[PDB]
Amino acid sequence: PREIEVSEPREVGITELVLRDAHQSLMATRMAMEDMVGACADIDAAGYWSVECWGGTTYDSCIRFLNEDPWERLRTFRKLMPNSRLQMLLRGQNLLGYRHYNDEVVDRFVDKSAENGMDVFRVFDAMNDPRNMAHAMAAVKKAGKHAQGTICYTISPVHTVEGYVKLAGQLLDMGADSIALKDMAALLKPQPAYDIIKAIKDTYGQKTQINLHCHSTTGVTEVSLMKAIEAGVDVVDTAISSMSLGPGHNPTESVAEMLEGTGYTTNLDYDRLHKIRDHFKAIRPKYKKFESKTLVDTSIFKSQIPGGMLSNMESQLRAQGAEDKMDEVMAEVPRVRKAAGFPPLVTPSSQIVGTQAVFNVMMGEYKRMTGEFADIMLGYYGASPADRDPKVVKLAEEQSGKKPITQRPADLLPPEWEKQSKEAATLKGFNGTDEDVLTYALFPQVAPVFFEHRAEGPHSVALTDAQLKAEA
């Protein structure tokens, strides 16, 4: 009988994700605003450390499918949840956009987010390249808001506890007010959860604030949450029980209840949590057309491939006849990833790698690369966790005509704000605010159609109470 050191009795902070990541993961970010605002009061009085309610795919979803202005959604939340720390997910130099943007666009986006009420900015990069997060972090500090540097967790031959402790130091070196360990594919097991959270605390000290964001996709992360807390994690992200599990997250009430008697405790009001649970439990059924159909999947521990990525490929394979070659492409991924430097397999890396893996089982190994893949191999998306296969790099140099870069990609981007400003100002509907110019800069394709319909007001693509009853 050995022994395990655990942190002193203490409160554990909880961030509620129901308003953003939960519906983004369980119902394709289609959650309408009218189905959320009725819980904002209770959520505000629940006792959460922070409430994730913006950023991520919600901006896209708002203008693309709900005819809703993300900014207006941010202002209503700021108003309905006055005492809460609002939190968002922002993908560094990419913001919530489709590409890297010149620093001047980042400054404004952060600026307006803060100005409209955002308090905590979780800045992250798919490649885990601290340089892509650098300027975003700065803008956040400039606006006097909380800058949370993010480490996208993943499993690979080059990812080690030491490798994560180093990244933490870089994030702190660039002024991170706290470090977020983000595990979107529920790959973080219990021992690793404990060792990593302990290693960071031991190296930079107990005052270092760390927030653990784990999905429940594989079904082992709630145990990791307990281990992270024993290791001393400061805040853990959860989703209200009526909106949890599956590709979602662990249950807030479940994570709050499991601690009774451990010496660890949460600052949550269970009666409030109970109102928020019922609120979404009544609403969720209307979103049945967008739910996933797998509650637990551990396959990723053997294949390194996340369901969303696996399926996306399977379709590409049928849409091209002989898909049965799935077994072949499922074996090419590991090799393609390695070539790219073992980037964490999250959007967009996951589709970039997945797709390329197909063009390797199809035409031939790198006989032809997509423009996106070539861009990763050449460094236009940043630095990889491990050096990329010089061979495949050269091949990309020859197939693209672009030369490899190794410095922060945005270092080559020219000012564009003025160019954006003018362009958006010619679209019917444009209201003149920077907010709208950002909308156009982030979604050039949708900004037009949205600016023209916005006056109609937001909508819902969910079933109506009528459609619901008429179905069953």
Binding site for Co ion (CB under 5 A): 21, 184
CA distance 233 to 198: 8
Could you tell which of a copy of itself, Co ion, none binds residue 21, using a CB distance below 5 to 8 A set by kind? Co ion
Nearer to a copy of itself, 55 or 247 (CB): 247
Distance between CA atoms of residues 443 and 246, nearest Å: 30
Residue type, 358: V
Contact partner at residue 1 from Co ion, a copy of itself, none, CB < 5 to 8 Å by partner kind: a copy of itself
Q: Residue holding tokens 């289609």?
A: 30
Look up residue 290 and give its DSSP letter.
G
Q: Return the number of the residue (226 or 410) whose C-beta is nearest a copy of itself.
A: 226
Nearer to a copy of itself, 1 or 321 (CB): 1
Shorter beta-carbon distance to Co ion: residue 184 or 300: 184
Q: Which is nearer to a copy of itself, 222 or 435 (CB)?
A: 222
Rama region for 408: left / alpha / beta (φ>0; ψ in -120 to 50; rest): beta
- Which candidate, 417, 398, 419, 337, places its Cα nearest to that of 159? 337
CA angle 109, 113, 119 (to 5 degrees): 135
| Minimum distance from residue 301 beta carbon to a copy of itself (Å) | 6
Type and span of the H or E element at 387? none
If contact means CB under 5 to 8 A according to the sort of partner, which of Co ion, a copy of itself, none does residue 302 touch?
A: a copy of itself
Query: Judged by CB, which is closer to a copy of itself: 261, or 321?
Result: 261
459: left (phi > 0), else alpha (psi -120 to 50), else beta?
beta
Binding site for a copy of itself (CB under 8 A): 1-8, 189-192, 218-220, 222-226, 230, 241-242, 244-245, 250-251, 253-254, 257-263, 270, 274, 281, 294-299, 301-302
- Shortest approach of Co ion to residue 183 CB, angstroms? 8
Structure tokens at 267: 């600052």
41 binding partner (options Co ion, a copy of itself, none; Cβ < 5 to 8 Å by kind): none
Distance between CA atoms of residues 279 and 242, nearest Å = 9
Taking CB within 5 to 8 Å according to partner kind, which of a copy of itself, Co ion, none is near residue 261? a copy of itself
301 binds, among Co ion, a copy of itself, none (CB under 5 to 8 A by kind): a copy of itself
Q: Which residue is associated with the tokens 């916005």?
A: 454
- The residue of the chain with the least Cβ separation from Co ion equals 21
